[PDB]
Structure formats: structure tokens, C-alpha cells
Amino acid sequence: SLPDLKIEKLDEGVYVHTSFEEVNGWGVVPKHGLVVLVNAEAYLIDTPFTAKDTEKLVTWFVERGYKIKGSISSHFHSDSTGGIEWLNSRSIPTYASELTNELLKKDGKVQATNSFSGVNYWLVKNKIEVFYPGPGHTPDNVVVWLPERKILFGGCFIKPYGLGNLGDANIEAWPKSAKLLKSKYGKAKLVVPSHSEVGDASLLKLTLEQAVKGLNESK
Ligand SMILES: Cc1ccc(-c2cn(-c3cccc(CP(=O)(O)O)c3)nn2)cc1
Ligand SMILES: Cc1ccc(-c2cn(-c3cccc(CP(=O)(O)O)c3)nn2)cc1
Ligand SMILES: [Zn+2]
Numbered sequence: 001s002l003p004d005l006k007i008e009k010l011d012e013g014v015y016v017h018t019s020f021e022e023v024n025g026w027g028v029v030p031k032h033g034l035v036v037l038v039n040a041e042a043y044l045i046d047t048p049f050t051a052k053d054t055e056k057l058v059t060w061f062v063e064r065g066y067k068i069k070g071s072i073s074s075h076f077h078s079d080s081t082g083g084i085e086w087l088n089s090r091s092i093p094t095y096a097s098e099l100t101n102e103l104l105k106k107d108g109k110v111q112a113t114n115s116f117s118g119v120n121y122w123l124v125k126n127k128i129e130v131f132y133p134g135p136g137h138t139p140d141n142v143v144v145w146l147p148e149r150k151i152l153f154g155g156c157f158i159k160p161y162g163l164g165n166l167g168d169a170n171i172e173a174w175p176k177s178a179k180l181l182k183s184k185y186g187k188a189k190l191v192v193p194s195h196s197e198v199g200d201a202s203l204l205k206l207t208l209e210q211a212v213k214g215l216n217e218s219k
């Protein structure tokens with residue numbers, strides 16, 4: 001069996017949601033995402049694994065006075081996109097990069113209703129920024145930046161002690177992409193990985209070291 005969805009406040013207007021699922025061979029695994037409050041409204045940064053936990057997530061904030069304005073997925077794997085079907089069925093706007101949407105369609109998965117492209121996209125100007133560092137954990141992976149808090153949600157790109165599942169990874173590009181990410185957000189106060197503890201900007205340096213190391217290993 002699986003632990004309940006957890007929601008804990010991380011900072012002002014910023015929550016970490018952790019959901020869990022059973023994976024063959026691994027057992028129970030965790031996945032972190034964020035909910036960001038913009039005034040009277042809430043944005044999901046990644047959905048939980050399932051429809052059912054996305055609804056519990058959504059409900060928790062609706063019940064506390066926050067309309068769900070939208071939801072953005074950092075990449076196509078179902079630890080970021082599992083709730084997109086449910087959200088869409090509720091007319092809650094979902095966002096993903098054009099690259100993410102291709103990879104969802106290609107796997108027979110429901111796509112985000114809205115898409116964006118390129119390096120920098122404002123989901124909410126001056127409050128929620130999406131950045132594309134280049135291929136790494138997946139071809140499509142992006143990170144989300146909360147400039148008012150200097151909080152970076154890094155998703156499954158942020159891999160300080162081992163790169164994780166390499167099946168969709170781009171090992172030759174990841175050092176590049178990690179270097180760009182480090183240069184751009186070295187002033188982050190908090191960096192939030194998908195599968196490990198929140199840390200500071202040093203997670204950016206360790207991820208770059210890991211990607212280099214992974215690229216060295218493959219030879
Ligand atoms: C100490 C420790 C050891 C392992 C992990 C871990 C393994 N995870 C995992 C493994 C296989 C598949 C998936 C599903 P995804 O690829 O994320 O869509 C997730 N997820 N977290 C965490 C902490
Ligand atoms: C101290 C410590 C120990 C372990 C970790 C850790 C394990 N991670 C992991 C391993 C295998 C699979 C996956 C899922 P994904 O790559 O997203 O497909 C994630 N990710 N971080 C971090 C810190
Ligand atoms: Zn992934």
C-alpha cells in the first residue's frame with residue numbers, strides 16, 4: 001500500500017505536494033511537485049501520479065478559498081502529467097511545452113490543452129516562469145521559477161546523487177543543459193527535486209557533476 005498525498009507549506013504562497021506509487025522492482029517511490037498561490041488563485045507545478053490524488057490536491061486548495069487557475073507539467077513522464085486527463089475533464093487549464101505534448105501524444109497519453117515553446121515562458125508574468133535548459137533527464141524537461149521567492153522546481157532534472165532512469169535521457173546534452181541551468185539560477189534560495197529533499201543552489205552544482213559523471217561512465 002501507498003502513503004497518503006502530503007501537502008506541506010514550504011514558503012509564503014508555496015506548497016510542496018508529495019504523492020507516491022508502486023513501481024515494479026523499486027517498490028513505493030515518492031514524487032514532489034508544488035502548488036503556487038497567486039493572490040486568490042492556485043497553480044499546480046506538476047500533478048500527482050493519478051487522477052485521484054490530483055483531485056485531492058485540487059480539492060484541498062479549493063476548500064481553502066483558492067480557485068485552481070492552471071497546471072503546468074515539467075516533462076512528459078507520468079510523475080508530472082498523470083492528472084492532466086482529470087484536470088482537462090474539469091476544464092482546468094493545463095500547460096506543457098510543445099515538446100512535452102508531442103511525447104504525450106506519442107505514448108497515447110492525454111495532452112495539455114495549452115502549450116508553450118522556447119527557452120523562457122511566463123505562465124504568470126513576474127510570478128511563475130518556465131525555463132528550458134536543454135535536453136537532460138528527458139528531451140522536453142523544463143524547470144519552473146518563482147522569482148519573488150527565488151524557488152526553482154527542478155523536477156526529474158535535479159539529480160544530485162545519481163541520474164535516475166536513463167531510458168529517455170540525453171546523456172551527451174545533460175552537462176550542457178545542467179551548466180546552463182546552474183548559470184541561470186545560481187541565486188536560487190530553494191531548489192526542489194522530484195525525488196529527493198529540497199535543498200539550496202548547490203543541488204545545481206551536484207546535478208551538473210552527476211551528468212558529467214554519467215557521460216564519463218558511458219565510455
Ligand atoms: C533513496 C531513493 C531511491 C530511489 C528513489 C526513486 C525511484 N523512483 C522511480 C523509479 C522508477 C520509476 C519511477 C517513476 P518516474 O520515472 O519518476 O516517472 C520512479 N523515484 N524515486 C527515491 C529515493
Ligand atoms: C541521497 C539521495 C539518494 C537518491 C536520490 C534519487 C534517486 N532518484 C531516482 C532514481 C531512479 C529513478 C528515479 C525516477 P526518474 O529518474 O525521475 O525517472 C529517481 N532520484 N534521486 C537522491 C538523493
Ligand atoms: Zn521523468
Ligand SMILES: [Zn+2]
Pocket residue numbers: 077079156194195
Ligand atoms: Zn521522475
